[PDB]
Amino acid sequence: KSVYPLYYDSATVKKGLKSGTLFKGTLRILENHRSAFACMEDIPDFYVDGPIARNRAFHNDVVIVEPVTRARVVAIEKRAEISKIVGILRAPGWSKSSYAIFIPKDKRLPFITIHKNDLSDLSGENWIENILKHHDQLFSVEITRWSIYSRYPMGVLGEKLGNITDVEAYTNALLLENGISSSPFSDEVLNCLPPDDWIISHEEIKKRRDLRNELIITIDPETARDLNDAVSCRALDNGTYEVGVHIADVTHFVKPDSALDKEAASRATTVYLVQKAIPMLPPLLCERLCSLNPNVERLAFSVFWKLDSNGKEIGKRWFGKTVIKTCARLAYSEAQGVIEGKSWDDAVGKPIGGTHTPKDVETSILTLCEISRKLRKDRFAKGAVEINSTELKFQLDEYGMPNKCEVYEQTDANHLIEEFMLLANRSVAEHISKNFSNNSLLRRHASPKEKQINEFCHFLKSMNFDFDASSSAAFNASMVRLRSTFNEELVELFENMAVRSLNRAEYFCTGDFGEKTDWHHYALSFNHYTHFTSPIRRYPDIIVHRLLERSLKNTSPGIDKKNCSLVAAHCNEKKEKSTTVQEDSQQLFLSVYIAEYCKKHDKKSMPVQAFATRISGNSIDVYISEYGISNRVDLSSDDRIKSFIVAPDDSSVKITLFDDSQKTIALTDRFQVYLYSDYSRTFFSIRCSLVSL
Template identity: 40%
Template sequence: MADSQHNPKNRRQQANQMHNHSDDPTAMPPLPVQQPQQQPRNQSNNGHRKSASMNQPQSQDRNRRKNLGPRFQDESNESDSYGTLNPNFQFGARRRQTNNSISYGNHTPSQSLGGPAQIPQLGITPEQLLLQQQIEQLQHQQRALIQNQSQFIQQYDQQTLNSRMNPNANNPHIPNIPNIPNIPNNHRRIQSQQAPNMRMSGGNLTQYSPHSPNLYNPQGSPQMKNIPPKGHGRRHSVNVSKVTKDLNDFSFPPSNTVNKMPPQSAQSGHGRRISTGQAIQQPIPNNNQSGVPDLAQAQSQLASLAQFRVGVGAGGHNRAQSFAFPNSFQNMVAAASLSAALGGNQMGKFDNGINYALQQQQAFNLQIQQPSNHGGPQRKSLFAPYLPQASLPPLLTAGKLVVGMLRVNKRNRSDAYISTEVLDADVYICGSKDRNRALEGDIVAVELLNVDEVWGTKKEKEDKKRRKEENAQYDALRAINPSIETKQQAKNRDDVQVEGQGLFLIADEEVNDDQKPKYAGHVVAIVERMPGQLFSGTLGILRPSSAATKEKQDAERREREGGIPEAQEKPAQRPKIVWFKPTDKRVPLIAIPTEQAPKDFLSNSEHYQNQLFVSCIKRWPITSLHPFGTLVEKLGPIGDVQVETSALLKDSNATSSEDFPDSALRCLPALPWHIPQEEYGKRRDMRNERTFTIDPDTAKDLDDAVSVKVNSDDTYDITVSIADVSYFIKPNSPLDKDARKRATSVYLVQKALPMLPSILSSDLCSLLPDRERLAFSVTFTMDKDAKVLKTWFGRTIIKSCAQLSYGNAQNIIEGRQLDVVEGRKSDKYTSEEIGGDIKILYKLSQKMRQRRFDEGALKIQTMKLAFQLDEHGTPIDCMAYQSREANNLIEEFMLITNITVASEIAASLPEQSLLRRHEDPIPKRLDAFQERAKELGFDIDVSSSKALQSSFLAVEDEEARKMLQVLAVKGMCRAKYFCSGAIDISSYRHYALNVPLYTHFTSPIRRYADVVVHRQLQTVLEYGEEAEKNFQMDRETVAKTAQQCNVKKEASKQAQESSQHLYLCLLISDLTKRYGPVVRQATVIGVLDRAFDVLVNDMGIEKRVHVDQIPVNEHKYSEQHKTLDLYWKKGVDVISWLVENSSDGHLQCIQEAAQKHAPAHMTSRSTQDEQALFDESDSDESDEDNDYDNDNDMVNKKNNDMDTVQHNKSKLAYQPKYENVRVENGKYIQTIKDSMTVDIIVTADFSASPPILKCYCGNPFA
C-alpha cells in the first residue's frame, strides 16, 4: 500500500480478542483493515465528521512528523501494515491545526451530549473571566499566608520534638509565632482515612471514587471538596497534642496515626535497600504550600521509619546498589497526581489552625518517638506506622519508592506481590510484617529491600519450622494425639480447599523454594484502599489457632488424668470479641465485638457453625495482630444457592443489588417515551436501512446492530449502530454516578445484575425490532476485499427489522433457511433479503479475519461453560461454549469499530482518551510456557503474537491445542483500561489484537467505559480541534474512571466464574445422587513430584490430583522424564479408602451413592477382568443400564426425562480404560505423564463455602 495516499482515520484496523476479554463484543480476536489507494473527502447532510484522504507527498509526511514531541518521535516514525502514522495524530499534546484538517459539519455546541436537557456549556462571558481572575488572586494571597504559617508551625514542631527527645538540653529560644491558636488537649475528630482528594492517578496507580460529584468539571481541574469518605467510613478520635493509641489505627483508607512506641531494640535484622531511582528529567514543582515536606525531610522520615521497624521486630535490610528504573514515567505520574491532590481544596482546609498535611506530619513525628516521656503500660507495636501521604511525592520523584497494586498468594498468604509498571518484574513482599496491614487490591507505596537478605530470612524461618516438626517432642505429641497435623499436611489440606473453590488452578507464583524473586520490598504507605470491601465467612468464639491449641491441651489432659468432669471446669469469662473467619483465605481473621453477634451465639455457638455472615474491616492498630471489624449481616446456611450467590457477590466486590436508588430512577424519562422531534433534525435518519441485531437467543440488552448497503460502484456501506446510551445518562447525574459505581453488568448463571435500570437496558436503549431507537453509528465504505475506503461517524435514528440469534445467522451461513421466532422480525423485509445481507457480512468478515491473523493477531480460545437450567432454576446440563462463524462475524465488525473509534478520539484527545491496552506477556512466564510446551513435544514460537498464533494453528490435534492454550493463558497479562495521558505511549499497544490503539465503544448498555468513549467521540465530532479544551473530564478524572472500570471488570469476571463454579457443583452433586460417582476422562497437563494437573474438557475445569488423596503404597517422581509412578493398592476402591482415612462427611454420601448404583460405575473387579484394563479395542461404550433401584419410581422417571449430555454420560455403565499401567514384581504401577488420558472422579463438597470441587484419580487395580 502506498504511503502517499491512504485514509489517516482508518489506519489501524486490526484486532484480536484476548483470553480474558469477556467484556469484548464476542470475546475473540481482531483483524486489520487495509486502506484504499485514495478516498474522497465528503460530508453528509447531517454534518457529522468523515475521515478524509491524505494527498500530501511522502516528504511532507516526514516533515510533519518533525513537529512531534521527542516522546512520540519513535512511534511516529514506525510503519505498519497501514503505513506511517497520521502526521496530524499526536499523543501527549494538543493536535495542531493543519491544512488537511477535517470538516466537522454544521453542528453547533448546543448539540452536545444527551437530549433536551443539555449540560452547561463552557463558554464564559468577560464578566465571568474577570471574576475568575479576582478569585485566582485571592487564592494566591491565601497560599502565601498558608506558606508563612506552615513554616512557623514546622519550626515550632521541630523545636518541640528536640526538647522531648533531649529533655536535659537547654531549650532554644522559641520564636513568637503570631496568629497561631492554642492547640486544645482534647480529642478532635477527623476522618479515619486519607483525605478524599489524596488520591493518585495513572494506570493501575489510582483508585476511583464512584461517589465523587465533580468528575465532570468544566474548568478542567477537579473540585475535591464535599466528597464523601471512601472505604469503610469509620471515624475515630485523634489527639493531635497528646500521644494516644487510637492514632495508630489502620483505616480504610488509612490515616497516619500516633501511638506511644516501645523502646527500640539494638539494630538487627534488615536494613533498607539503596534507592533504585534514576535522575529525574524535571522535578515536579511543589505548588502546595500546606506543609508538604521536601525530599530531605521525606528521606529523614523514611530513615526514621527504618529505625522504628528494627525496634518492633519488623526488621530491615541493607541497601543494595542503586540502579535506574526500567520505566520511571509511572512514578512521575503518581508523584504529580499526589502533589496535585495535596494542593487541593480539602488539603487547604484548616481546623483549629492546623492543616491536614501538617497534622499528618505531626502524627508521624510523634509515632516514631521514644515513649519514655509517657507513663502507663504500653502494648507492643507489631507493625510500623505509615509514612504521611504528603511525604510520598518527593520520594516517588526521587525514585526512593515505587507504587503498585498488591496481590496476596492464595496458596500462602505470607507471600504477596506488588504489580508495578515502574519495574520489569513484580516486587516480592515477605510476611505480614513487610506487608504491613495491606490487603488484596490495595494501592501501596513500597521501599525496595535487599533481595538476598529477604530471601535468606525467609529460608531461615522455613528451616526453623521444619526442624520444630522433626524434633522428638513434636513426635511425642502426635503419638498422644494423632489428629495433630504437620505443617506440610496442613498446607496440603489448605491447598486442596483453595484449589477446589474455583474452576481453574491457581497460577503458581514465580517465587518458590528454588528461585528467588528479582525484587523485594516492604509497604511503607497505603495510597488507596480497595473501596467498600465486604467479606463472607463464619463466626467462632475462639480464634482457630487458639481452638486447636485448646483441643490439643484438653486431649493431653484427658490422656494424663483420665478426663475431668465438666462440673469441675471453671466457668469461662464472657469474651469481649468473637472471631470472624473470612471465606477468602487471603483475608486475616477479624475481631468482632461480642455485642454484634447473635444474642444466643455464646451459649449456642454450634448452631451458627454452618451459617454465613458478612463483615467488613474498620480499623487495624499497629499494636494488634488482627484487624477489628463490624458484622454487617447474616446471610444464611452454607450450601444454600441464594446464600452462596450473595456471598460470592460480596467476596468479589461486584455489584450485588438489582435495585437502583430513587435518585437514579428519577433521572429516567417518563413512559411512554418518544424520540423528541428536534432529534430528527440533528441525526442522520437510517430508519429505512435494513438494520438487524445478532445476539444470544436470551439476550435482552441489544446494544449493537448492523446493516449492509450495496453501492453502484460495487462497494459496500457497512453500518455498525450502537445504542446511544449517553443520550439518556447526563454527566454527573445521580444515574451517571450509579452507573459509574457499578461500571459493568454482572452476568451470573441464573440472572444478570444490570449496570442500568431495565427501562433503559431492556427497553429504551435496547435496539428492539420495529422500534425507533437513538444510536451512535459508524459507517465503513468497503471494497470487495473488505478494505476500508472511508469512514463516517455520527448520531443516528435507526429502526431494526429483525432480532436474530447466533443460531439464526449460523443457519444462513450454513445454507439453511432463516427461521426467526415470531415477533422478532418486521414484515417490511423478507427472510431472503435479510439472509442475503448476512451472507455479504460473513464474506467480508472472513476476509477481515484472515487479514487480521496474517498481520499478527492472536486468539486464545479459553474454556467457557454454558448451563442448561430447568423450570426451577436447577442445572441439568453443562457444556463447553463453542464459538461459531456467526459469532466471528459480529466480532470482526465490533472490533474494527472499536479500533477506528480509538484512533479518532486519541488524535483529538491525546491526554484524556479512555483506551484499552494489553501488555506483552512477562518474558519469564512466556519462556516457561515455551519450555513446558517443548516437554510436551510441541515447538512453540513465542517471539511475537503472530508467531504464537501460527504455532497454535500448526497443532492439528484439537485437544492438544486446547491444552496448550490453557497453559499459555497463565503467562498472559490482563487487558486494562487506561487514560492516554497517564502512561507512556510505548505502553498503549494491545498485544493480543496487535494494534497500537484500542478502546471499547460497542457495549454501552453493560459497560460504563463505553459510555465515556461515546461522550469523547461526540465531543470530537462537535468541537474538532478544540475537543481537548471542551471535553469535561480532565486526565486525572479519566484515569480514576479507567481504574474503577478495571476493578469492577475484574470483580464481574470473578463473580461470573464463581457462579459457574457454584452451579457446576450443584450439577455434580445432583448427578452423584442419581447415578453414583461422576467419572469423566481428563487430559494430564502437568506432572509434579506429589501431584499432577488434569484438564476435564467435558466440564471445562482444570484441577490438581494429589497423591496423598488416593490409595497408593508409594510414588516415585522422575525429574528427568517428568513422570510420576503410582504404586497402587490392589483391590482398594478410591472412595472407600478415602472414607476410611478421612472424617469428611460428603465422602460417606458418595460411597453410599456408589454402592447404590454400583452396576453403572467402577467397582471392584475380579482377576479375570484385570486384563480388560490393557485392551486396546476402540469400542469402549456400553449399552445404557436401566437396572436401577426401583424404590423410587419418581427418580427413575425423572432420570428418563433428563435427556441431557451430562445425564446421559452418567447413566451409561462406564467401563474405563487406563493408560501406562503394568504389574512388576507383584507391584501395581501406573505411570503418569503429560498428555495421557486418565479417568477422574469429580466430587462436590457443600459442607464448605464456597463448595469445594475435588478430583480423584481412579484406581486401575481396584
C-alpha cells in the same frame, strides 16, 4: 510477649534497602495458607513460611522483607484494600466460653476473633445457642484491630448473608467480596429518568439520519435483554457495499455529572452472573428505551464504511446520530443456521417487520458473513492473536438448579458480529484520538510480560516445542504449528497457558502517554482501539460516545485528562473484579452441577477424562477439558492407593496399589479421574480424586 516482631523504623528500613539486606516486593499468600511468597519481579521470588514471618500481612500487600529463599516481614509499604471479609462463625473451642471464631472463605485470610458477644442479630444471653442455630449461615466481618499479643486480629460481625446451601445467598456473598453494588437504584437516579412514555420527536428524526426503512438486525444470544449492537449492509450499485454499525445512543439519555451518570460511573460495568445480572443502568433505560428491540424506533449512533468483497475500506466513513427501526432480532444459533444455507423458516422463524423480504435478510446475512470471514483472516494475518478461551454455559431448570453444563464454542455468527464490532471500535478510537489527542479514553494492551512467556516457552521446551514471542504474529504462528502438532485437548491447555502469558489490557487517557507508540494492542495488532459498541454496560463507552459526539461537533472534550485517567483506572479495577465474580459464579454452578450428578446417578463422584499437566512431589495437576478446569489429584489424599514413586525428572510417576497392580503414568497422558463437590469443608470446593467414590 508479642507474638510478632515490631516493624522496623522507616530510616532503618531505608538503610537496609541501601545495604542490600532489605527487599521490597508484592506479597502473594497461597490458598493452602502458612505458605506465602514475596513476589519480586526481577530478583528471584522469596518464600515465607509461617504467619510469624508474615508479620500480620495480607494478600497483594506490598511489603519489605529481610532475609533470615526465605525471609521475614519487617515492614508493610502498602496494604491493598480488603474488600469485606465474608465467611462463617464458629463457637469458641468448637469440637468452653470465649471469643467467637470467624473463618473467612478466602483461606488466605487468617482466622478472626469476634469480641465477647459482639453482634446485633445473635448477641446477648444464649449467644452460643444462636451461633449454633445459625452455624450454616454465611455472615460478613470487618477488621477492627490486630494486637501483636494475639495470633489473630479482631472484628465486628456484619449482616447475615444467609443459607450456605442457598445459591443466591452465596451469590450475594460473592458480590460483597468484590464490592459490587446489588442494591436497587437510588430514587434520585430514577428522578433523572425521562418519562416512560417518551416518544420519538419529529425534530430529532429530522436532525438525525433516518435509517428506519433500512434492513437492520441484532444478532445476540437467546438470553439477551439489553441489546446494544445492530449490523446492516447496503448493496451499492457498483461491486461494493455500505456496511453500518449502530449502537444505542445512551448519552442522549445519560447526561454528564447527573446522578444517573454518577451511579453509572460507580458501577462502571454490568456484571453478568449465571442466574441473574447486576445492571449498570436502571432497567427502564437498559431494557426499554435504549435497548435495540425489534420493530421499535430508536435513537442510536452509527458508523458506516464502504467495503469491497474482500472487505477493504474503499469509500469514506460516515459518523453520526441516526434513528433506526431494526427489522428483526436474531439469535446466534439461528444466524448460524442461516449461514449454513437453511431457509429462514427452518432456522430463525421470526416475523420481519417492513418491506424487507426473507431472502433480502438472508442475502444480507450471507454478505456480512463473507465480509467478516475476510476481515478476520486479514486481522490474524496482520499480526493478531487467535485465542478461543473457555467458558461454562449452563442450562437451568425452573428452580434454577443446573441441569446442563457445557463448554461454549463460537460459531461463524459470533465472529461475524465480533469483527464488525472491532471495526467500529477501532474507527471510533482513531477518530477521537485524532481530534482529542489529550482527552481521549482508549484501550491498550502492551507486549506480554517476559517472565510468563519465558515460563511458557520452557514448558514447551519440556514438550519439545518452541514459541517465538519475538512478535504477536510469530506467537500466533507458533500457536498454529502447536495446534498442528498436538491433540486438541493438549492444545486447549496450551491456549490456556497462552492467555495466561498475556499482559493485562487496560483503559488509558491519551494524555498520560506522550509517545503514541505506547497506544497499541499487542494481541489485536491494532494501533488504535477503544470501547464504543456497548454503552449500556460499559461506562467507558459512554465517555467515548460523548467524545465522538464532540469530535463531530469540533468543540471541547468536556472531560479533563486527569478525570479521564481516574475513570480509566476505576473502570479497569471494576472490570478485574467483575471478571473474577463471573468466573467464581461459573465455579459455583459447576460445583452444584457435580452435586446434582452425584445425586441423580446414585454415585459420590462424576467420572471424567483428564490430562496430566504436572507431576510434583506427592500430587499431580490434572486438567479436565470437558469443563475447562484445573484440579489436583493429591497422591497423599489418595489413601486408597498403596504407594508411588516419582522420578527425579518429574515426567513420570509409578503407582502401586493394595491389589499389587503397579502402573506408571507420565506427563500429558490421558486418564480418567473423578470430580466431587466437597461440602464437608466450610465452603463449596470442587475436588478431584483418582479413585471412584
